[PDB]
Structures are given as structure tokens and as C-alpha cells.
Amino acid sequence: MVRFIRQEAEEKANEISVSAEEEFNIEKLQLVEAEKKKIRQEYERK
Amino acid sequence: ASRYWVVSLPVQNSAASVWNRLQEQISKHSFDTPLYRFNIPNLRVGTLDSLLALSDDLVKSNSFVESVSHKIRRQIEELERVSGIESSSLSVDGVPVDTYLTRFVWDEAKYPTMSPLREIVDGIHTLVAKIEDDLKVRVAEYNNVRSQLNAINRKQSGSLAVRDLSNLVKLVTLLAVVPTSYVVPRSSKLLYEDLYTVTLFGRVADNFRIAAREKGFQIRDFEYSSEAQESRNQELEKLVHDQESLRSSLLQWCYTSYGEVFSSWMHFCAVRVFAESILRYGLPPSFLACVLAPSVKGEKKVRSILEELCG
Amino acid sequence: GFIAGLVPREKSMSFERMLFRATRGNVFLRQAVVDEPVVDPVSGEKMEKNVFVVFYSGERAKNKILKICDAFGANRYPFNEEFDKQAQAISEVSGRL
Numbered sequence: 001m002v003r004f005i006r007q008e009a010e011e012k013a014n015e016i017s018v019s020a021e022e023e024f025n026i027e028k029l030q031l032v033e034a035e036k037k038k039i040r041q042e043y044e045r046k
Numbered sequence: 047a048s049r050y051w052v053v054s055l056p057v058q059n060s061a062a063s064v065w066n067r068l069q070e071q072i073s074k075h076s077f078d079t080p081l082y083r084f085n086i087p088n089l090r091v092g093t094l095d096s097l098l099a100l101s102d103d104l105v106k107s108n109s110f111v112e113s114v115s116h117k118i119r120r121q122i123e124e125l126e127r128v129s130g131i132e133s134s135s136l137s138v139d140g141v142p143v144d145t146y147l148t149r150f151v152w153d154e155a156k157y158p159t160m161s162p163l164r165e166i167v168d169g170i171h172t173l174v175a176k177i178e179d180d181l182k183v184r185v186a187e188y189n190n191v192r193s194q195l196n197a198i199n200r201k202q203s204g205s206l207a208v209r210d211l212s213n214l215v216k217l218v219t220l221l222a223v224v225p226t227s228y229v230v231p232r233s234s235k236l237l238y239e240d241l242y243t244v245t246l247f248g249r250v251a252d253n254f255r256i257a258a259r260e261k262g263f264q265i266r267d268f269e270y271s272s273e274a275q276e277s278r279n280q281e282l283e284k285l286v287h288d289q290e291s292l293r294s295s296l297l298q299w300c301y302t303s304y305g306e307v308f309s310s311w312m313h314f315c316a317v318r319v320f321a322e323s324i325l326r327y328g329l330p331p332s333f334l335a336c337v338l339a340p341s342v343k344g345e346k347k348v349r350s351i352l353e354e355l356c357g
Numbered sequence: 358g359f360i361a362g363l364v365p366r367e368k369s370m371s372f373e374r375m376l377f378r379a380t381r382g383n384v385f386l387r388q389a390v391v392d393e394p395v396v397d398p399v400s401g402e403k404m405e406k407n408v409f410v411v412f413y414s415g416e417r418a419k420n421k422i423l424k425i426c427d428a429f430g431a432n433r434y435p436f437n438e439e440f441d442k443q444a445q446a447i448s449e450v451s452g453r454l
Contacts, residue, residue, distance in 0.1 A: 098415030
């Protein structure tokens with residue numbers, strides 16, 4: 001009952017953590033796409 | 047309509063003695079009660095926030111139910127043709143009202159969110175907000191029809207105070223003097239009969255005045271032209287069309303809105319019963335209660351059966 | 358949540374009757390003995406009021422419980438997490454009085 005609600009709140013915190021991890025993974029993919037774009041930029045420049 | 051008549055029975059202690067007894071072979075059913083209902087569990091167990099929201103919005107749900115009932119009753123009364131709907135004709139949850147309570151198929155993701163009860167409360171509030179638009183539209187249609195119907199065909203039938211151009215005789219004027227010899231050609235009689243005409247001619251204004259309003263009978267007021275009478279008749283036809291629309295097509299729309307409001311009230315009652323069960327039983331969604339409309343002695347029998355779990 | 362407060366012994370029935378669904382059967386209030394009338398926070402004449410601590414679940418339920426406790430008017434003080442701190446606060450309050 002009450003322990004179930006507390007575990008639900010803890011699982012909500014863990015789900016926020018997982019959503020943050022997924023958003024960070026997507027952001028990392030975008031950042032490394034930008035890094036590949038930059039690498040191509042100075043590579044074509046070189 | 048019908049007020050909320052569902053006893054708040056948790057799953058562990060249902061309406062009858064046994065939890066499964068509520069569905070069939072109930073002690074209430076021994077008194078011929080049609081009480082039979084079920085609830086579709088939510089995807090996840092609702093949090094204490096959902097119970098708090100239900101407790102806070104109980105008054106709001108009561109207000110919404112009152113608004114829905116008043117709007118439906120007024121729509122049925124005013125149009126005078128929307129009352130033809132019945133429990134099966136309303137088709138709450140695609141079933142008659144008795145079967146509507148037993149039908150929990152409306153608790154899917156379609157109207158409710160099907161998410162934890164916290165989102166279910168918001169979905170119910172959104173449904174009530176949408177339902178309020180039905181009452182607003184009904185009020186607007188009623189106002190428009192009442193304006194249209196009273197606008198025309200409310201005058202007289204000719205040769206009277208108003209709309210006397212329809213009974214006009216078409217040197218002469220619309221008088222219809224209801225309870226003359228001169229040089230002017232008074233040897234004439236107008237066809238302004240429903241009233242009567244008098245000997246008059248336009249060559250002498252004195253003769254026309256004497257025959258219309260100088261003494262005795264008074265000249266009745268009329269629409270300026272017979273074309274005004276024809277336009278009044280056309281507007282009367284249009285007003286009859288608008289009133290018939292409001293009383294038949296808008297009445298059917300009002301009956302559909304009443305059925306939708308009954309379905310929404312049933313869903314809100316199911317949500318409230320789920321909240322009450324969560325208060326009186328395990329938090330995860332689980333209900334075994336029943337809903338019906340028995341007599342006062344039937345309510346007493348239900349209370350005797352469910353005294354194990356009483357509020 | 359924390360529902361620390363007080364519930365009068367005389368008004369115990371009213372407190373139990375009100376917000377019964379809020380307790381939900383998992384919340385129990387440990388009312389004080391209140392054998393001697395507990396001095397009211399504003400009334401020196403004192404009244405037979407007890408102190409009870411309940412469990413708060415749900416924001417609206419906690420707000421309603423707090424409002425009911427305030428309307429009760431019993432001798433109520435915030436309850437510290439550690440019982441020793443609460444006892445020290447009680448001793449300090451008694452000395453100041």
C-alpha cells in the first residue's frame with residue numbers, strides 16, 4: 001500500500017534517470033554527428 | 047435524469063457478501079436487484095496524487111454531474127422531442143443503462159487516458175469540459191430558434207392591428223374600418239375583407255378620411271405593402287423551419303449529448319469508485335462493485351449486505 | 358508525508374468522522390492521554406485536548422488533514438524526526454513558560 005506508493009515514487013525517479021540517459025544518448029549522437037561535420041569541414045579545408 | 051446510485055464497494059468487500067457474489071447470485075440480487083458492474087484496471091497503479099486529486103475534485107464531479115443532468119433535462123423539455131431517448135436508445139457504453147454499468151469497455155484509452163489514475167482524472171476533467179460545449183451549443187441554438195420563431199408568424203391573420211396587409215384589397219388605403227357621398231367617385235367597395243370596406247375615393251381626401259378614421263370605426267394598421275405580408279409569410283416559414291430544426295435535429299443532438307453525458311457520468315462514477323476502493327483496499331486498480339437503481343428497501347438491503355465495509 | 362499535529366480528546370469522534378476516506382485504513386493517529394486539560398496555544402484557561410500524529414498520503418489529503426488539525430485548536434507543535442529533539446524542545450518550552 002504505502003510502501004507500494006513509495007516504490008512507485010522511487011521508480012518515477014528512476015524513470016526520470018532513464019529518460020535523462022536516453023536524452024543524453026541522443027544528444028551524444030547529435031554531438032558526434034556535429035563532430036563528424038566539423039571533421040569533414042577541417043578535412044576538406046586541409 | 048437518474049442521480050448517481052452506485053454504492054462505493056471495494057474489490058475485497060464488494061456489494062454482496064462475496065466479491066464474486068456481486069456479479070451474480072448477490073444477496074441484493076435476492077431482492078431482484080440488477081446490480082452488476084465491473085471496472086477495467088488502469089495500466090499502472092495510481093499514486094497518492096491520484097487519490098488526492100479525486101478527493102479534491104469530488105465536488106467538481108458533483109458540479110459537472112449537476113450541470114449535465116440540468117442541461118439534459120432542459121434540452122428534453124424545451125425541444126419537447128428529445129425525451130424519446132431510453133436507456134437502450136441512449137446506448138451508454140453501447141448498452142442499456144443497466145448493462146452500461148456492467149460494461150467497462152468504455153474505460154479504454156479512447157475516452158479515458160488509460161494511464162495511471164492521475165492522468166485518468168485529467169481525462170475525465172477534459173471530457174467534462176468538452177461536454178460543457180454541448181450545453182453551450184444547446185443554449186445558443188435555443189436562443190437562435192426562439193428569436194426566429196417569435197420573429198414571424200407572431201402577428202395577426204389580417205384585417206387587424208398587425209399583419210393586415212395579407213387581407214388587403216389587393217385612391218384606396220389599408221384601413222379595414224371595424225366597428226361618404228361627395229363629388230369623388232364614392233361608388234366603390236374595396237376587397238379588404240377578412241372587416242369591411244366603405245365607400246371612398248382618392249379624388250377627395252375628405253371622403254377617404256371619413257370612410258377610414260374620421261368618425262365611428264377606426265382604420266386598422268397594416269404592413270405597408272402586400273410584399274411586406276409575403277416577406278412576413280416567408281420569414282414565418284423560415285422560423286418554423288428553424289424551430290423544427292431545434293425541436294427535431296437539435297433535439298436529436300441534445301439526446302446524443304445526454305447519452306454522452308450519461309456515459310461521462312458513469313466513467314466519473316467508476317473513477318470515484320476506484321478511488322474509494324483504493325482508499326478501502328489495495329492501491330492498484332481492482333474493483334468488484336456493482337451499480338443499479340433499486341428502491342429504498344433495496345438500498346436498505348444493499349446496506350445490510352455491505353455493512354461489512356461501510357463509510 | 359508528515360501529518361504531525363494534535364487531535365483533541367473531546368473532539369476525537371469529530372476528527373475520526375471527518376476525512377475518514379483520507380485515512381484509508383493505513384493511517385493511525387496516536388492520540389495523547391490528555392488526562393489533564395492541555396493548555397491551548399492561545400487560551401490560558403486550557404482545555405481537554407489531546408495530541409495525535411497521523412500519516413499523510415496525497416497532497417489534497419495532507420492539506421485537508423492540516424486544515425482539520427488547525428480547526429481543531431488542540432495543543433499542537435511540530436514533531437521532530439528524532440524523538441530526543443522533540444523532548445528537548447518540550448523541556449525548553451516548559452522552562453520558558
